[PDB]
Design a protein around this ligand. Structure first.
Ligand code: AXE
Length: 472
């Protein structure tokens, strides 16, 4: 019948793997264009380059997430095999015309070429164009992958495929060369005790708190904007090959660790109580400027530092902090309460520019990865859970909508370098250092009923803050 006629027009399974009938044993949809819930790698590839209709949403999500279930080298091989479609044999009337010496009719072959081979091959090139344009990192990481792609794209003889090879060749040309401006007047760079150039005197209390907040916001904005979606998929930042797969993500996390621990270090290594109060007060001022700038990443780094085991227990220090600053810390902490309800409402209400709290995306992605299975079972056969990947991809999409928000703030190279080079842990491991920090906390403020000892001053310069109002 017509169902068999439609199927038998496609190539046979002994010579082509991407043309078997769809069943519950190899592909399932959710509930227009149907959304793919799960399937085999073969069926995913077929639907990635489906002949009847274009599916740009599935292409975007596939190329973002595929590394969680398929290697880059394996993906190339599959789209090559998908491209290399075998043509059906001519009919008996047509076949005899060849050995006689005459041109056949070839109506079934022309229709197959028109409505299958050409459409499928068109979609494969669209995937290649999307791959090189939006995920070039794969090709620069694995040089052999690029040679194969260039070799494949080089050997595509076609009239209708001429524009696609030209466009794909244009992008690799740009990406090869890509290896090697304010709208308003930025405010004047602020200084306090440390002079411009005197980099050896740079410190928490010697730099201006306004400028610490500005330079950290510029730094963190750049780090936030550098993170690519694929770095977050499949928990690849916690796997063995984390440094190659998730370098921008790891830079973000390590900065957060180093800044947070540096705040804690600054506090507990200031053993004199009155000096430690000035240190804590200055960090709260830094948070106030983070809040002015809508650098929520920054705000919650300060909250983390203040809520840490060595700092949160310093009752004698926080007694001397003015109620106004206590309230600022309370309201900052309140952002995180009830699954970040207040934070999320604040982030949606504001206009650009901002730096979103990065930690929440990592938390939610880790929950999705751990909470959903890697594969679904149907009739004994395991199928790749694509909905799991799409949910992770949807979270990385939220990250991307805040990645084009540059600040109207001038960089200070020396202050930038200071914060880029922070190494509060030194040559200690993290657990060792955080044990040291808590042991330091116990020394400076012993647990009751032990007495509170006095300690000498370490700072020879004035501790009064210049405040957080900028000059004008
Ligand atoms: C559920 O337990 C908590 C409730 C909190 N409620 C409000 N704020 C917190 N943290 C802020 C950042 C903060 C830190 C340290 C000293 C502060 C002193 C006065 C005002 C705020 C302080 C909280 C922290 C908690 O555990 C860590």
């Amino acid at each position: 019948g017509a169902m068999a006629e439609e199927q038998m027009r496609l190539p046979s399974a002994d010579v082509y793997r991407f043309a078997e009938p769809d069943s519950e044993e190899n592909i399932i949809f959710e509930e227009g264009i149907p959304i793919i819930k799960a399937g085999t790698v073969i069926k995913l590839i077929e639907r990635l380059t489906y002949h009847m209709y274009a599916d740009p949403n599935f292409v975007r999500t596939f190329l973002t997430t595929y590394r969680s279930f398929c290697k880059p080298q394996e993906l190339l091989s599959l789209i090559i095999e998908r491209f290399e479609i075998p043509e059906p044999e001519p009919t008996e009337a047509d076949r005899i015309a060849i050995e006689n010496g005459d041109q056949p009719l070839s109506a079934e072959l022309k229709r197959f070429r028109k409505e299958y081979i050409q459409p499928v091959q068109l979609r494969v090139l669209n995937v290649c164009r999307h791959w090189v344009e939006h995920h070039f990192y794969d090709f620069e990481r694995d040089a052999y992958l690029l040679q194969r792609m260039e070799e494949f794209i080089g050997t595509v003889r076609g009239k209708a495929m001429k524009k696609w090879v030209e466009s794909i060749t244009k992008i690799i040309q740009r990406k090869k060369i890509a290896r090697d401006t304010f709208q308003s007047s930025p405010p004047t760079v602020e200084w306090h005790i440390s002079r411009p150039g005197h980099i050896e005197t740079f410190d928490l209390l010697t730099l201006h708190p306004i400028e610490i907040a500005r330079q950290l916001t510029l730094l963190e904005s750049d780090l936030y904007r550098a993170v690519q979606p694929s770095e977050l998929v499949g928990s690849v930042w916690t796997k063995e090959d984390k440094e190659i797969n998730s370098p921008n993500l790891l830079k973000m996390i390590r900065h957060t660790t180093n800044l947070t621990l540096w705040f804690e270090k600054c506090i507990v290594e200031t053993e004199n109580l009155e000096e430690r109060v000035a240190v804590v007060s200055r960090i709260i001022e830094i948070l106030q400027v983070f809040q002015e700038l809508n650098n929520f990443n920054g705000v919650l780094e300060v909250v983390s530092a203040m809520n840490s085991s060595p700092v949160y227990r310093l009752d004698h220090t926080f007694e001397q902090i003015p109620s106004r600053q206590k309230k600022i810390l309370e309201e900052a902490h309140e952002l995180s309460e009830d699954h970040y309800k207040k934070y999320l409402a604040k982030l949606r209400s504001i206009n650009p520019p901002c730096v979103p709290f990065f930690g929440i995306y990592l938390t939610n992605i880790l929950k999705t990865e751990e909470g959903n299975p890697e594969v679904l079972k149907r009739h004994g056969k395991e199928l790749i859970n694509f909905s799991k990947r799409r949910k992770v991809a949807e979270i990385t999409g939220e990250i991307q909508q805040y990645q084009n928000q540059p600040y109207c703030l001038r960089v200070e190279s020396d202050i930038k370098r200071f914060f880029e080079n922070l190494n509060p842990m030194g040559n200690s491991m993290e657990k060792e250092f955080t044990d040291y920090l808590f042991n330091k906390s116990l020394e400076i403020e012993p647990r009751n009923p032990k007495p509170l000892p006095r300690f000498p001053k370490k700072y020879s310069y004035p501790l009064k803050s210049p405040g957080v109002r900028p000059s004008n």
